[PDB]
């Protein structure tokens, strides 16, 4: 089997419907006969009993610890994964056709392929699919720096400002092998993105790809995007 | 199951039986993300073939055999079934999917035939993984000899033909002709190569970069100006994709045209082809068996008035880009295989000594 | 005076820099207007003085753009007009001048109705359900096909030219008239030549052999049509007929910038490569079957007679 | 309106030493033709009606080379204006001489005397006139560049530039040379001031 | 007034613009028995043309000029009109009716052109019967010289070319070639003639009679046997019906094919044509201007297996019988005219001599 | 050209998925192409019937030539129904490919120049009838129903084992026949 979908829960079903139901339904629509779901334990370690009350074909719910991250979540399920990893989240309701990111993962044999939908400044090549840079001022002392080798190999890099991460990744086996071999990573969204973006700027190397959609948008953990979730689910869940 | 792709645009009336797909269209819109009907390596090969990332014939066959190695490595045997029948019954939807993504090369057809003859020759008294490792080693030995030993033999047979002070014409992108020119430049011959290119692939820049990085003085030209350079050109070297039983040369589309202008300027034609790219199938024109690419590839941006952008508004407008064409067998002089220098008249005859007879 | 001098030199730098005006009939009308403005603003007593004046200006006009032969053979036809009228008046100052002016008006009223006479004779060369092949873009062959499609139904395979695809203009201008046309590249010519019934092309300059220079890639089309034994139609006017032999003088092909073949964003392989872009090509007369001009159809074994009906051998070098 | 041009016929770079200590660097022939003839041919090919030649060092030689050429003939379309002063020493003093003398009228061409080009700039002129009538005389300069790969032997280490552009309206946000810099610093007020897209070039 | 004849049968898609009538019906079913719109001599000419009684080109032009003599002899002058305009206004319905009976040959077109040039060049100072006798004298003097004197000159130029012991190949039925062979047999040359014929006219039997009433040993065969007899044939003599501006020979349909097989057997062909059968009109194929005879003429009597009897009941069945075709100028060597032996490349130049220029 | 059940079966089943045009030209000794025309017109292939004299008149539009034969010779040459050497010459002039749909029991080792026993001559009644007159005494009428086509005017043979070149007929000859049995 090509993919093993992993759904993260780090601080949940507060809305017109369950927040866990939309990612699982999206997964169970196109394939994904077995789904590994990670339960939450930071806010309350009792949502897994709320996770086993759905009507899906097959779910794998595991208990987790309170103080844990997404990189620790992937390092926790390392002896039970044997193929590529397709990471998800709970608060992510997307009307985007999922097969674009998987087509970019298969067609170019990328090492990581991600999906964004219109803070974090990203630079993607003129083809629009392969990314080259991403940074925020949370960890930047200086304003912005660009490596010289990526300007010698890619002379024009289109930057984007309003793009937010929908947290839909496509990891390979050796990426999770290096993540398990390097226990200094705690948040995989800031670790697997920036370290692989730096290591791709080396010939024989790795490929990172991204799809910028223009159909819908994801949500957030806070109450800033909790008002549009019901308006999205009232007009987008009728077709699903 | 797999549906049939939507054929794009308005087809030519002479090309009504041949399919015409698009690259913005892909087959995996209605397929599973863990691919269960098609293998993951097979759908990865189909996506690498449909988008045009793997266009050379040897590269297509090598990636096909690597995907077949990953299929055999990820193969299981159901109860009360034999391998020699279930494998040919399961590989046919894979090859149908690969044909649906892009019309297959003849090297891929001969690889399919050789693999079917190999996995038919497996006895059921053998084990599962023993026969799987035997077939993987057979695929490895097959691609090993009929890529690198054939390439080294054709390069050695072309090194004793190219003289000093010669000027060589090439067309398209081929690994064999580029390896011949690189080994001839490194082994002592001093020459310069004229590169002929054509729209809309523009794949002559690949062998142009292969010739400049080798240190060879190059000349980049197009197909209408080749008639300007053929009075200067002493020898024409070409990369063949398939050779047919009448002696026709199926390759990129500007081959028989270029060979006719080369014969009109008395310049001999030297196609370079391996013995596994032969065919018992034969055709006499570029109309009964050919690949049709995207109709939106012919458009260009010459200023501000791209005219073939909304070509579908005109009902009496047809767009066409032929990929393969055949040559008359009286136009091509040399056929350089690993068995030596033959004419085109010995294309099926070598097949007779490659059919275990 | 000054206006005539700056109009003459504006024309010579316009032909030096780019294509001004666009097509050849406009430039022939501009050349005839320039020559009548020359002969209306000068002083001469003998015809040979004005002959050498027209020769002295025509040398610079052919030294501007040697690929543009319309100005050269137009100047040579005007010189033969001078020589014919001087011969008919020798066996003469204002009567001869007004006779030259009315002969130039005769040339203008023959030059304006060239394409419409080619369209009028277009119907005897096109049958129903016909496969036509066209190279480049030209208003003569386009008027030919759009007149022949008024009563006949056929097909036209217009082929784009690989340096700059000028045939897309002709394709989107023909498909508005309903020709059932097919656009392809010039790498497929002999791939499709097995089904092409007749090849109807234009040209840039008819040479004195019956040979022609035209847009590049049409000598290959002539070779493929000689291989498949299909006849060739050359829809050419009577001001593209020049006495310049093909292998006589230099500056035959017009080489342009190699930007249209290989772009500047290729890399440092541009410094170790030799990219040439000849936008013209030479077709010998043995690969040509029939020429179609406003006076009718002519063989390539007859063009020399038209030479003797339009040109003199002392003005060939001009 | 008539098209004007200010030509700087003296690059005050100290680079062609001791080459330019005999004849000035604008009179240096590439292939039988000096650079000033190429520049004046480009200026009369694009359609400039009047130029202003600003030569400072060895300017009598430039006056001797340019007067006997084609662009001082009365039959030439492009009139030239040779303005020589021993006071100015850089391009800013040239343009303040232009502003003090009130030479130009509307949207001239600032060009050096040693530029080889065949660029039809009239499209860029129409875009700049579009932006000056739309923005109401706020679009000030239209810098003309050319697509070339970073590996090209034309552009050297002393002439390589990196630009940051708003790619939908084609305005320059950042401009810096790569002379002695392996890292490149781009400010962040560029991204917060304009959020309609941005691309580095 | 004069209607048009209905097109018979299913036309060819390549011959959709050319008319295809039938011989069983004629246009005089809806016409007057005392012919008022058309002349009686003109309707007699049209009836003897449509039924196939006068099919040779010289005989067609001679009968046309005789009917024109009967028209001019039975012509009167109305008031307030001139002869030079009323005659050209009245002859055009006659020629249009003759065209509707049968597509006109080139000799008839040049006779119409010469008659127009003659009857527009008469003076208004002449009387009625004076001008009528002048035009009749011009007509029969013109046909006298440019038939009989031209045929005698062509036969005298052919007598100095035909050797003794020669083998001559002929095709079709013509007056000029049979007159040449008769005068060559009576003048002293000893030779034998091979007659080539084709379906469905079987008109060469006619000139076969013209070879046995003169005493020449003859051999009769058809166009499949031309490839068998052409190794024996030393020279090929042909009767041209029309010569075009590029040197092409518009003739009976088995000539360009026969000339190609004769060039393949290294036998030079010799067409015989006069200057009044020339054309400034030029064509390169037999598709843009050709005569279509009846589709019911191709059926045969082979026992009682007539398969083409009820051919109209089959909707997808097309029947075609071509009359004239065009030879390329690369195949024909000689044109024997009354001015001498000229090549095909001299066919329009003699026209410049024959336009009084 | 002619009539052969292999070529008409070829076309009448190839018209099941394709739509095209077949021009069946009759041969002058025995017009057997009328039977082929009425057999192909029942399948609806838009059959055009012509004579044998218009081949080069229609060779400007014919894309390829698909004929049969009577006997394939040892050097790639073939005897066939008469008038097809002219068709092969016209198709070589127009460079159109020739398809010889022939089985492998028409493969003969008999060379062309061998005791002049090539052509089969039949009665001349079908060329010139007996009711022609007294002119039949002083005339020499021959009717060869077969014709010789060299291998250089042939592009491709189609046998039941596949397509073969005329440069490959010697291998089928040595694979099906022995050189010691050529005299028989
Ligand atoms: O459909 C097309 C389009 O042609 C092309 C368009 C594009 C390209 Cl790339 C290649 C060819 N052409 C037609 C033109 C009539 C023809 N012939 C017929 O329909 C009938 O065939 C006959 C029938 C009788 C005779 Cl005598 C001759 C031909 C078929 C093909």
DSSP string for C191-212? HHTTT--EEEE--SEE-TTS-E
Name, in order, each residue with C-beta under 8 angstroms of E52's C-beta and a sequence gap of 6 or more: E23
Placement of tokens 């589709």 in the chain: E295
Q: How many CB atoms lie within 10 A of CB F102?
A: 24
CA distances to B154, E64, F155 from F164, rounded to whole Å, are: 26, 58, 9
- 3-class state of residue E72 by DSSP: helix
- 3-class state of residue A107 by DSSP: helix
Strands B235-243 and B269-272: parallel
Assess contact for A108 and A207: CB atoms under 8 A.
yes
E246 and E190 co-located in one domain:
yes
Strands C232-235 and C198-201: parallel
Residues of F in contact with B328 (CB under 8 A): 95
Name, in order, each residue with C-beta under 8 angstroms of E336's C-beta and a sequence gap of 6 or more: E154, E157, E158, E161, E270, E271, E272, E273
Placement of tokens 């292998």 in the chain: C247
CB-CB under 8 Å, D186 with A161: no
* Gap from CA of C131 to ligand 1 centroid (Å): 7
Chains in touch with F (3+ beta-carbon pairs under 8 Å) read B, C, E
Q: Nearest-CA distance from A35 to chain B in Å?
A: 12
Spatial CA neighbour of B152 closest among B277, B350, B276, B338: B338
Residue F21 exposure: Cα atoms within 13 Å on the Cβ side = 14
Residues of B in contact with F100 (CB under 8 A): none
Q: Convert C250-281 to b/e letters by CB count within 10 Å (16 or more is b).
A: eebbbebebebbbeeebbebbeebebbbbbbb
Strand order across the beta sheet in which C181-184 lies: B317-319, C181-184, C155-159, C131-135, C198-201, C232-235, C290-293, C296-298
Assess contact for C299 and C291: CB atoms under 8 A.
yes
As a whole number of angstroms, the distance between CA D106 and CA E356 comes to: 68
Strands F47-50 and F23-25: parallel
Tell me the torsion sign for CA atoms C255, C259, C263, C268: positive
B349 and B301 co-located in one domain:
yes
State which residues form the domain around D109: 4-201
As a whole number of angstroms, the distance between CA D164 and CA D171 comes to: 9
- β-bridge mates for residue E136, sequence order: none
Boundary-marking domain end, from E119, E153, E187: E153
SS3 readout for chain B: CCCCCCCCCCCCHHHCCCCECCCCCCHHHHCCCCCCCCCHHHHHHHHHHHCCCCCCHHHHHHHHHHHHHHHHHCCCCCCCCCHHHHHHHHHHHHHHHHHHHCCCCHHHHHHHHHHHHHHHCCCCCCCHHHHHHHHHHHHHHHHHHHHHHHHHHHHHHHHCCCCCCCEEEEECCCHHHHHHHHHHHHHCCCCEEEEEECCCCCCHHHHHHHHHCCCCCEEEEECCCHHHHCCCCCEEEEEEEEECCCCCEEEECCCHHHHHHHHHCCCCEEEECCHHHECCCCCCCCCCCCCECCHHHCCCCCCCCCCCCCHHHCCCEEECCECEECCCCCCCCEEEECCEEECHHHHHHHHHCCCCC
B29 and B91 co-located in one domain:
yes
Strands A164-165 and A112-117: antiparallel
Spatial CA neighbour of B307 closest among B316, B296, B322: B296
Q: Nearest-CA distance from F120 to chain E in Å?
A: 12
As a whole number of angstroms, the distance between CA C22 and CA C6 comes to: 21
**Helix, strand, coil percentages for chain C (3-state, nearest 5):** 45, 15, 40
Name, in order, each residue with C-beta under 8 angstroms of F113's C-beta and a sequence gap of 6 or more: none
Residues of A in contact with D184 (CB under 8 A): 145-146, 148, 151
E160 and E86 co-located in one domain:
no
E115 and E169 co-located in one domain:
no
E41 and E189 co-located in one domain:
no
Mutation for testing the B interface, residue in C157, C158, C182, C187 having most B CBs under 10 Å: C187
Taking only Cα atoms into account, the Rg of chain C, rounded to an integer number of angstroms, comes to: 21
Q: Resolution in Å, one decimal, please.
A: 3.0
Spatial CA neighbour of A208 closest among A117, A144, A129, A102: A129
CB-CB under 8 Å, C297 with E16: no
Q: Who among C130, C297, C305 is closest to E282 (CB)?
A: C297
Spatial CA neighbour of C192 closest among B253, B259, B247, E286: B253
Backbone phi and psi for residue A164, each to the nearest 5 degrees, phi listed first: -120, 150
Structure-block tokens of residue A163: 């793009």
As a whole number of angstroms, the distance between CA C139 and CA C169 comes to: 11
Strands C155-159 and C181-184: parallel
Taking only Cα atoms into account, the Rg of chain E, rounded to an integer number of angstroms, comes to: 22
Structure-block tokens of residue B272: 């370079």
As a whole number of angstroms, the distance between CA A133 and CA C153 comes to: 58
Spatial CA neighbour of B337 closest among B284, B280, B279, B277: B277
- 3-class state of residue E196 by DSSP: strand
Q: How many CB atoms lie within 10 A of CB C303?
A: 22
Boundary-marking domain end, from B94, B119, B153: B153
Q: How many CB atoms lie within 10 A of CB B175?
A: 19
Structure-block tokens of residue B279: 């065919």
CB-CB under 8 Å, D191 with A148: no
- 3-class state of residue C263 by DSSP: coil
Spatial CA neighbour of F12 closest among F99, F4, E298: F4
Q: Convert E127-166 to b/e letters by CB count within 10 Å (16 or more is b).
A: eeeebbebbeebbeebbeebbeebbebbbebbeeebeeeb
User: Which residues have C-beta atoms less than 6 Å from ligand 1?
Assistant: B 12-14, 320; C 129, 131, 155, 157, 182, 184, 192, 195; E 12-14, 320; F 21, 23, 48, 58, 61
Structure-block tokens of residue B187: 């082994």
E48 and E161 co-located in one domain:
no
Structure-block tokens of residue A1: 């089997």
CB-CB under 8 Å, E329 with C299: yes
Spatial CA neighbour of E169 closest among E241, E271, E225, E237: E237
As a whole number of angstroms, the distance between CA B72 and CA D131 comes to: 64
Placement of tokens 């004629």 in the chain: E26
As a whole number of angstroms, the distance between CA B5 and CA B23 comes to: 12
Q: How many CB atoms lie within 10 A of CB F103?
A: 13
Assess contact for C69 and C51: CB atoms under 8 A.
no
Boundary-marking domain end, from E93, E126, E153: E153
Assess contact for B294 and C224: CB atoms under 8 A.
no
- β-bridge mates for residue B20, sequence order: B292
**Residues constituting chain C:** 318
Residues of E in contact with C117 (CB under 8 A): none
Spatial CA neighbour of B335 closest among B121, B157, B170, B209: B157
Helix (H) or strand (E) holding C147: helix C139-148
> Tell me, what CATH number does D36's domain have?
3.90.550.10
Q: Does C130 touch chain B (CB under 8 A)?
A: no
- β-bridge mates for residue B27, sequence order: none
Q: Nearest-CA distance from F61 to chain B in Å?
A: 14
Q: How many CB atoms lie within 10 A of CB F138?
A: 13
User: Which DSSP symbol is given to C302?
Assistant: T
B122 and B3 co-located in one domain:
yes
Supply angle C-alpha A174, A177, A180, rounded to 5: 155
As a whole number of angstroms, the distance between CA B45 and CA B27 comes to: 13
B192 and B146 co-located in one domain:
no
CB-CB under 8 Å, F138 with E217: yes
Structure-block tokens of residue B178: 């580029």
**Residues constituting chain B:** 357
Q: How many CB atoms lie within 10 A of CB F179?
A: 10
As a whole number of angstroms, the distance between CA C90 and CA C103 comes to: 17
Q: Who among F56, F138, F142 is closest to E218 (CB)?
A: F138
As a whole number of angstroms, the distance between CA B8 and CA B25 comes to: 9
B163 and B303 co-located in one domain:
yes
CB-CB under 8 Å, B200 with C185: yes
User: Which DSSP symbol is given to E147?
Assistant: I
Backbone phi and psi for residue B183, each to the nearest 5 degrees, phi listed first: -70, -30
Question: CA-nearest residue of chain E to F35?
Answer: E307
Question: CA-nearest residue of chain F to E321?
Answer: F50
State which residues form the domain around B50: 1-153
B334 and B192 co-located in one domain:
yes
SS3 readout for chain D: CCCEEEEECCCCCCCCCCCCCCCCHHHCECCCCEHHHHHHHHHHHHCCCEEEEEECCCHHHHHHHHHCCHHHCCCCCCECCEEECCCCCCHHHHHHHHHHHCCCCCCCEEEECCCCCCCCCHHHHHHHHHHHHHCCCCCCCCCCCCCCCCCCCCCCCCCCEEEEEECCCCEEEEEEECCCCCCEECCCHHHHHCCCCEEEC
Q: How many CB atoms lie within 10 A of CB C4?
A: 14
E123 and E192 co-located in one domain:
no
Residues of D in contact with A159 (CB under 8 A): 191, 197-200
Tell me the torsion sign for CA atoms B127, B133, B134, B136: positive
Residues of B in contact with F162 (CB under 8 A): 245, 280-282
Four-point Cα dihedral A14, A15, A18, A22, nearest 10? -120
Spatial CA neighbour of C230 closest among E284, B85, E213: E284
Q: Provide the domain count of chain E.
A: 2
CB-CB under 8 Å, C195 with F96: no
As a whole number of angstroms, the distance between CA F141 and CA F165 comes to: 37
CB-CB under 8 Å, A99 with B34: no
Q: How many CB atoms lie within 10 A of CB D62?
A: 24
């Amino acid at each position: 089997m090509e993919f093993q979908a992993v759904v993260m829960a780090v601080g949940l079903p507060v809305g017109n419907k369950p927040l866990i139901w939309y990612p699982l339904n999206l997964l169970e629509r196109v394939g994904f006969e077995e789904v590994i779901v990670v339960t939450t334990r930071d806010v309350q370690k009792a949502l897994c009993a709320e996770f086993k009350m759905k009507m899906k074909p097959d779910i794998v719910c595991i208990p987790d610890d309170a103080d844990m991250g997404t990189a620790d979540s992937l390092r926790y399920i390392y002896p039970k994964l044997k193929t590529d990893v397709l990471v998800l989240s709970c608060d992510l309701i997307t009307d985007v056709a999922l097969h674009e990111v998987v087509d970019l993962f298969r067609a170019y044999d990328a090492s990581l392929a991600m999906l964004m939908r219109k803070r974090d400044f990203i630079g993607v090549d003129s083809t629009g699919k392969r990314l080259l840079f991403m940074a925020n001022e949370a960890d930047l002392d200086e304003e912005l720096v660009i490596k010289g080798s990526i300007l010698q190999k890619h002379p024009r890099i289109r930057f984007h400002t309003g793009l937010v991460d929908a947290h839909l990744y496509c990891l390979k086996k050796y990426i999770v092998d290096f993540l398990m071999e390097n226990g200094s990573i705690t948040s995989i969204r800031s670790e697997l993105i920036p370290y692989l973006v730096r290591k791709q700027f080396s010939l024989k190397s790795l490929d990172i790809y991204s799809f910028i959609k223009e159909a819908n948008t994801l949500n957030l953990a806070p109450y800033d995007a909790c008002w549009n979730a019901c308006r999205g689910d009232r007009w987008e869940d009728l077709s699903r | 199951q797999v549906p049939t792709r939507k054929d794009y645009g308005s087809k030519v009336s002479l090309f009504s039986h041949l399919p015409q797909y698009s690259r913005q269209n892909s087959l995996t819109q209605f397929m599973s993300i863990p691919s269960s009907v098609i293998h993951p390596a097979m759908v990865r090969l189909g996506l690498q073939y449909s988008q045009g990332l793997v266009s050379g014939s040897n590269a297509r066959c090598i990636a096909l055999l690597r995907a077949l190695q990953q299929v055999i490595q990820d193969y299981t045997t159901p109860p009360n079934e034999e391998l020699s029948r279930d494998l040919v019954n399961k590989l046919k939807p894979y090859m149908s999917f690969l044909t649906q993504c892009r019309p297959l090369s003849a090297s891929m057809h001969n690889a399919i035939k050789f693999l079917n003859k190999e996995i038919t020759s497996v006895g059921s008294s053998k084990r599962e993984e023993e026969a799987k490792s035997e077939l993987r080693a057979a695929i490895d030995r097959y691609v090993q000899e009929k890529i690198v030993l054939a390439a080294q033999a054709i390069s050695r047979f072309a090194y004793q033909k190219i003289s000093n002070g010669d000027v060589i014409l090439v067309y398209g992108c081929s690994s064999l002709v580029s390896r011949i020119l690189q080994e001839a430049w490194t082994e002592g011959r001093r020459f310069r190569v004229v590169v002929v290119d054509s729209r809309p692939w523009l794949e002559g820049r690949h062998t142009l970069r292969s010739l400049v990085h080798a240190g060879v003085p190059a000349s980049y030209l197009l197909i209408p100006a080749a008639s300007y350079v053929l009075p200067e050109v002493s020898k024409v070297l070409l990369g063949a994709h398939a050779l047919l039983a009448n002696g026709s040369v199926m390759s990129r589309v500007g081959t028989a045209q270029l060979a006719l202008v080369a014969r009109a300027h008395n310049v001999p034609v030297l196609v370079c082809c391996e013995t596994y790219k032969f065919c018992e199938r034969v055709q006499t024109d570029a109309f009964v068996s050919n690949e049709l690419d995207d109709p939106d590839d012919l458009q260009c941006k010459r200023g501000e008035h791209v005219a073939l952008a909304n070509w579908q508004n005109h009902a009496s407008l047809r767009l066409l880009n032929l990929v393969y064409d055949v040559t008359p067998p009286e136009l091509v002089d040399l056929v350089i295989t690993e068995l030596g220098m033959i004419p085109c008249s010995s294309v099926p005859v070598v097949l007779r000594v490659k059919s275990s007879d | 005076g000054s206006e005539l001098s700056e109009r003459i030199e504006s024309f010579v730098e316009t032909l030096k820099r780019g294509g001004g005006p666009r097509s050849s009939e406009e430039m022939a009308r501009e050349t005839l207007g320039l020559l009548r403005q020359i002969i209306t603003d000068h002083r001469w007593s003998n015809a040979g003085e004005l002959m050498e004046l027209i020769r002295r200006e025509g040398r610079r006009m052919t030294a501007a753009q040697p690929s543009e032969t319309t100005v050269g053979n137009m100047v040579r036809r005007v010189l033969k007009i001078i020589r014919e009228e001087y011969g008919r008046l020798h066996g003469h100052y204002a009567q001869l001048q007004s006779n030259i002016i009315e002969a130039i008006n005769e040339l203008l009223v023959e030059l304006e109705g060239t394409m419409e006479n080619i369209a009028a004779q277009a119907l005897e060369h096109i049958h129903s359900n016909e496969v036509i092949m066209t190279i480049g873009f030209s208003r003569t062959v386009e008027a030919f096909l759009k007149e022949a499609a008024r009563k006949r139904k056929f097909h036209v395979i217009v082929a784009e030219c690989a340096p700059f695809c000028q045939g897309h203009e002709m394709a989107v201008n023909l498909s508005k008239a309903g020709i059932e046309t097919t656009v392809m590249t010039d790498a497929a010519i002999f791939a499709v030549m097995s089904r092409v019934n007749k090849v109807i092309i234009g040209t840039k300059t008819i040479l004195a052999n019956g040979a022609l220079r035209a847009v590049t890639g049409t000598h290959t089309l002539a070779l493929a049509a000689k291989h498949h034994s299909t006849p060739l139609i050359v829809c050419a006017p009577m001001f593209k007929l020049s006495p310049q032999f093909p292998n006589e003088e230099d500056s035959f092909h017009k080489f342009v910038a190699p930007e249209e073949v290989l772009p500047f964003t290729e890399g440092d392989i541009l410094e170790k490569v030799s990219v040439h872009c000849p936008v013209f090509d030479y077709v010998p007369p043995e690969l040509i079957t029939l020429f179609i001009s406003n006076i009718g159809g002519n063989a390539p074994s007859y063009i020399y007679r038209l030479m003797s009906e339009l040109y003199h051998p002392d003005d060939h070098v001009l | 309106p008539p098209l004007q041009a200010v030509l700087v016929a003296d690059s005050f770079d100290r680079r062609f030493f001791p080459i330019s200590k005999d004849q000035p660097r604008v009179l240096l022939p590439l292939a039988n033709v000096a650079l000033i003839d190429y520049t004046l041919e480009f200026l009369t090919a694009t359609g400039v009606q009047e130029t202003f030649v600003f030569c400072c060092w060895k300017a009598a030689q430039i006056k001797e080379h340019l007067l006997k050429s084609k662009w001082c003939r009365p039959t030439s379309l492009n009139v030239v204006r040779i303005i020589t002063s021993e006071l100015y020493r850089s391009l800013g003093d040239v343009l303040r001489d232009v502003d003090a003398k009130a030479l130009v009228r509307s949207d001239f061409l600032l060009v050096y005397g040693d530029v080889i080009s065949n660029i039809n700039i009239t499209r860029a002129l129409e875009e700049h006139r579009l932006r000056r009538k739309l923005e109401k005389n706020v679009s000030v300069m239209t810098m003309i560049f050319k697509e070339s790969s970073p590996s090209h032997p034309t552009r050297c280490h002393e002439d390589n530039v990196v630009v940051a552009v708003d790619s939908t309206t084609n305005r320059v946000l950042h401009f810096q040379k790569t002379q002695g810099l392996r890292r490149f610093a781009f400010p962040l007020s560029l991204f917060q001031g304009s959020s309609d897209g941005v691309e580095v070039r």
